[PDB]
Symmetry: D2
């Protein structure tokens, strides 16, 4: 109220839509009976009440967009497209603004044009956006003696006990922030921001304001000459596919994910309409756990993070559980090994999975296995490319944590660096620098 600088917004208790089909709910119930790690500790009655609100709200995504994403990921799996996945390590309600969202959309589009030129194939753009509000925590108790911050969907960043309590009213706040962010992403991707014309000045600014600019000048000129040639051949914006940026987040809070399930076909299926695609993290990918089982039940394309403890046998079990119908690009295996280990640990995993006859996307996450040194991030992607080139497999994409702000979170870049509510992000300049360097890797 007036005394503590907060407003209370009532949660309208509105009539339920018809329930999801009994057969699909029976399958979901069996999956959710499995143990789930890293779940909020709020009471069941509060969770149930807040899920019931979300069961009737307009979805963030629609099934036809998830079917189109699946078709494009099939192309990535077959080595005919590249996947660019990036955005905030953790979205916050406080930072869920037009300038921040516009910055992350600009960064993805800029990176995607550079990678398209380097790869000579289409780039599928998947933002970490409109739902990246939950994170696991290793530490029971943080450095201030407080219950850990678990992301805005669970508790508050503010270092005080009351803010840190798990409150499932944050499930509804998360949905409101997701739907508002996704509304703006849809608006921006049909706006003049999505014009290839703008890339000239973006890359020019990058080359001029980067100390290592002169290093990227030649490729930036090539891209510009490329764009001008397209235009000279008579290609106007009106003649190009509208920019498509898909939404993703880690499927961590199963209360949120289950309330955002909706029915679509030509057999009836559950779609998670909180996002287009979701991944399962290092700490929640237990083969007999609720997260993998939930991923088995939904129609969405899914990802699994593979850390340095991954065996080829377990990677193949993920393939059998999550791609039982052999649908290329339904499953993405996300390497996060560390730059010193990817060259040793990834090859035997890739061989054994390739031998299943299943076609996964191989995606590099060079952040989570490495504050963070830019050079080690670049070297893990380099190693990932080396592993695939050696094995004749497709280095399918990258998963990076970035922002279109000139923040100071990752060491290195041309800036010789000596606001995240989580891990360090590459700033606007470092994320573009990485795109230039991965474009060279795709070319070499």
């Amino acid at each position: 109220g007036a005394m503590n600088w907060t407003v209370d917004i009532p949660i309208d208790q509105l009539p339920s839509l018809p329930p999801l089909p009994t057969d699909l709910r029976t399958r979901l119930d069996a999956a959710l009976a499995k143990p789930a790690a890293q779940q909020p500790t709020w009471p069941a009655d509060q969770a149930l009440a807040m899920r019931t609100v979300l069961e009737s709200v307009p979805p963030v995504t629609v099934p036809s967009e998830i079917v189109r994403l699946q078709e494009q990921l099939a192309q990535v799996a077959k080595g005919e497209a590249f996947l660019l996945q990036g955005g905030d390590c953790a979205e916050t309600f406080m930072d869920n603004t037009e300038p921040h969202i516009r910055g992350n959309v600009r960064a993805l589009l800029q990176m995607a044009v550079v990678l398209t030129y380097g790869a000579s194939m289409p780039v599928v753009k998947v933002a970490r956006i409109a739902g990246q509000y939950a994170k696991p925590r290793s530490a029971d108790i943080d450095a201030l003696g407080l219950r850990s911050y678990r992301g805005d969907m669970i508790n508050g960043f503010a270092p005080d006990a009351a803010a840190r309590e798990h409150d499932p009213s944050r499930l509804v706040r998360a949905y409101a922030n997701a739907s508002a962010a996704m509304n703006l992403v849809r608006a921006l991707t049909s706006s003049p921001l999505a014009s290839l014309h703008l890339v000239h000045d973006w890359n020019r600014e990058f080359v001029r304001t980067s100390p290592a600019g002169a290093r990227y000048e030649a490729l930036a000129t090539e891209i510009d000459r490329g764009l001008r040639f397209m235009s000279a051949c008579g290609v106007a914006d009106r003649n190009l596919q509208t920019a498509e940026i898909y939404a993703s987040h880690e499927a961590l809070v199963l209360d949120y994910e289950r309330a955002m399930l909706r029915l679509s076909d030509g057999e009836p299926q559950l779609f998670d309409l909180s996002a287009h695609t979701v991944w399962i993290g290092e700490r929640t990918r237990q083969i007999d756990g609720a997260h993998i089982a939930f991923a088995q039940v939904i129609a969405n394309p899914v990802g699994v993070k593979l850390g340095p403890n991954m065996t080829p046998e377990l990677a193949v079990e993920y393939v059998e559980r999550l791609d039982p119908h052999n649908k290329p690009g339904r499953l993405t295996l996300v390497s996060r090994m560390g730059n010193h280990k990817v060259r040793d640990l990834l090859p035997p995993i890739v061989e054994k999975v390739q031998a299943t006859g299943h076609q996964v996307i191989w995606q590099c996450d060079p952040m989570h296995g490495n504050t963070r040194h830019f050079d080690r991030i670049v070297d893990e992607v380099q190693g990932f490319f080396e592993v695939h080139r050696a094995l004749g497999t497709h280095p399918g994409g990258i998963h990076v944590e970035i922002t279109g702000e000139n923040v100071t979170e990752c060491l290195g870049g041309a800036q010789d660096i000596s606001e995240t509510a989580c891990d360090p992000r590459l700033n606007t300049q470092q994320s573009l620098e990485l795109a230039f360097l991965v474009a060279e890797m795709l070319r070499d």
Copy 2:
């Protein structure tokens, strides 16, 4: 929190000098039909909305203005329709899908009848406020003024004006607009679906047999376009714009954003276009002054007491730069009066050299379906006699079948 059924929000760059001066001067004018909640509580809720992602963006409003200019010039037709009042309880995917289908279906019929493009503007993503003649309703309760102000429930507590409804209205608007954007790029927007929609309408309508001939023509037209090699891939993605009555000045001012004709302007990014209603169009009032300060295309409702002189004053205040499409004059006269009252208004305004859209609202001056049809018929008669453009309709959607029926009847009017 959850145990209080509340979301808790902690509340803890300047406008160009001239835009601050003009916005302050507009808001200091008398405002009719405003909620009676405390200024301090309203300021807190506006502070939440100051930083949220907008419902719309300026490039869409600039594009709408270009498409409305085409309407004003007699080269396109405006279809504006949707719920009389959106409610939080009906702000669901099936309801929004139904309203999007109805508009798309009505638009294809009108396009065929007019032989020109139809600009689609939904009453959606913020039609949460209404004026009321009487502050006490027939049950003796403070009047329900829409979910942005109070609750429909017939109890005094629910009818208290609640400024938290500014934020609930935005959340509900954002969620609706997200889905409208998703649906208009989805298979729902394919012209192929019109065959089955019109087939169902003709087969299940009492007066179906009456519309079978025009429905068959449209089908043969769609098939011809396909036969000439036109696939969905080769057509403009469907654009449905968002509109609502700009009534609650707390909400509209909170949703103002600055954007660059080179010079920074204020856009109301709660919608693409907004209108000013019959009870809030006081010429020296805050609503008309607020409409003068925003870049959006605007509408003004004109009822039976409208004079030609005052219609001209609206046009000169709201279209001062002579930009076709910037202003829509919405006739709502009643079927018995539109033929007598509208001609002298159209003549005086046409004489200024300003080019407004003339739009027919056949609801609010009349509900018997036949009287609604007759007001639009009268509107068309007025323009045909003056050689002016009957530019569009504004409807409240009449169930699904009656709204489709009206589209078929107005398509015949555009063909006459």
Copy 3:
């Protein structure tokens, strides 16, 4: 030279072995209706034509075959029309422009009626030869057999068979095809022109009033497509293919070229498609054998003495690889006989699992306009009863107005 009214031409890589064997074997078969000029003079004229630029190229013939496959499958309609006999004297820009306009106009009417694409094939750029029942005509002169063979002038000298007419025919064909290519990429090919063409037809036709309703529907269809945002820039450039009766084997063999389904084939590049007439379709004759050796889509005319057994033999010899669209069977039965004679032919051929185009030629078995219309009506009746595809018409263009009238009447048949 000029003083002799002559152009003087000095006459001073092998086919794949199997194509040489097959072409030689086809040409050694008996050939009906051939010119009677000396072999040595014919060889000299063929030697000129061996090196000239082709009238057509293989990529166009491959594309036509794909579009005809669509006809065979019931997803497109074939319109084939033009002069009964092209003449050098009428091979002028105004005449060619008139024939191109008539085909484009008939095609848009048929497209609207069929609700599917229309493949346009002109009798043009080589329709310079005709067979004759009698070698001596009613004046007692050797029969005129078309400008590729002799002269129309009623004197014995003009009627002598003149092999120099092979080269004159090619020059006239090349010049016509050049202009057809120019006109189909010109403003003449814009759908916008159909409004005025149909308006003129309805206003100047005796039975105009009869076609006004369909002409208005087509106009409303065209305007709808434009209103949906479809400009000429967004449509397939108009494609008019070249055809003629493959009659003079000297001409067709000289215009053979080799092109690569991977393997080298012979294409007749005097045209896109050629047909074999009623007087030259001897099953063991050179014409049918020549049609078997070329890659082009081909047609065979079927008159009233056709049996189902022989129609099947044509299909098995000319479509040996089961390629839909490769073969067109052209019914020319007469309006009194098509309903009786065509059904058992269609049943036997459909049973083979080969997919031919069924095309109606309502001219050569009948000229009273009403009998021409009735043969096409009968053709449609036969296919409707069998559930087979009435795939197209082949007309001789009947003046301009009657050919348009027939398009309107067949459009109604496709709609029934």
Copy 4:
């Protein structure tokens, strides 16, 4: 006949179409009363008879194509497109074959894609084709003691007196060969030959089989990466403007040009429908002569060759006679100075014409002022670019004599060279090499 290995083809005497309008014929009569240099010496009665045949034949070109060419040449004049004009020095009836025409169409398309990439603007393609059958001659008597060969429209190449007699039956033979060539050009430009996809293998073959290949490898790779980027952005052939190749020749034989006049508008105008655009040569550009006057009367865009004797005053008189209505790109001034003289002689001409306020196309003909050394040809274009860069004017295009045959006619190129019925042409390899070098000039 059978004894001398020739066939006589009768010229059908067919009915006349209506005459052209009396007012336009009265203007044409005044122009043609002026002296005409280098005209065939055949009798008036034979010329009249043969013109009358051509007055009723289908045109080679139509007015809407000439209106579209004029719009594109306006873009060249304004520095927003580049003009590529090339083909045979002299076409022959004997060589007017599918392989020869396909070779010249391939060469123009290949050169145009390279120049488009280098210029970063559209390239207008104008072939010397379907009518380049007449040439002037300086020499009354050639080296064999014979009346000179004047091109296939006038007399025969064969070194015998009878072949060398001027025979206006060759006007009709020229028309037949023009219409057949133009028919094939129209067919080829809508065929798979016109696909940008084919440029990869064309440039690859050029780089691999050129001894100076390694010199062009980098630009050939850039173009390939450019094309692949276009395709990766979703641009298919179906989404590009059909290739347009216009027809041109020197308007030399006024009997042919006048018989090919047709009427079109919105004031009635004479169009020369033997071609899209015609130029007037060095030896026939007399300011008070019939050729310039004929060019004044026709609607077609026109060119005038400017040799080393050209003064700025005379260049400005051409501008006033041929561009009286100030229509950009209606007039092309074609520099043919020689590599040693263009840097000295062109600047004062460009200055004086620029000062008229008229916008001509400046086109370089580096052949006719220089057998021919490749290096001197390259150096004249270099000098032309230098003159415009210095003056801030638009180096608008090139006019080159080329063939898609591996002939040995020009000295130099990567081939270190130590079939034309006239001047030496650049072979397939030299013409492509020149396009690569002019692309660098447009880039520098």
